[PDB]
Amino acid sequence: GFDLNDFLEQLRQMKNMGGXXXXXXXXXXXXXXXXXXXXXXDDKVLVRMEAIINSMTMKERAKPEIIKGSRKRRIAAGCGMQVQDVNRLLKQFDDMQRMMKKMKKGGXXXXXXXXXXXXXXXXXXX
């Protein structure tokens, strides 16, 4: 299936090619609903991302749900960073694992057609 080794590969392949002005322009469908400026700083987020993924042992990378409080302490200590960044990175891998399972079960055109952008009420951003 999908692992943080496969996310390691997706990430050292994506930190090579990627930019935030070539990625926020290839879509004008979610550059109208979300602010055109909310992309990221790609170099920093993918260098932190590759740092945090590299700090992992091979059994924590191949199986991402065995990572708990002590392991996040240690991933924060080896890459010299915050337990909160490690947290929200295990959370983005959680969502993209969710989405590659939803591309796996349903066809590429049914999981690209039923994808939804939302407003809590129809007024802009509110």
Binding site: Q10, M14, G18, X23, X24, X26, X27, X30, X33, X34, X38, X39, X40, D42, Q92, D95, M96, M99, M100, M103, X108, X112, X115, X117
Partner: peptide, 18 residues
């Protein structure tokens, strides 16, 4: 291609708005 662009788009992109 098809799964390269559907990976890459929803990945960088849905990394962004959530």
């Amino acid at each position: 291609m098809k799964q390269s662009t559907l990976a890459l788009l929803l990945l960088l992109l849905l990394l962004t708005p959530v």
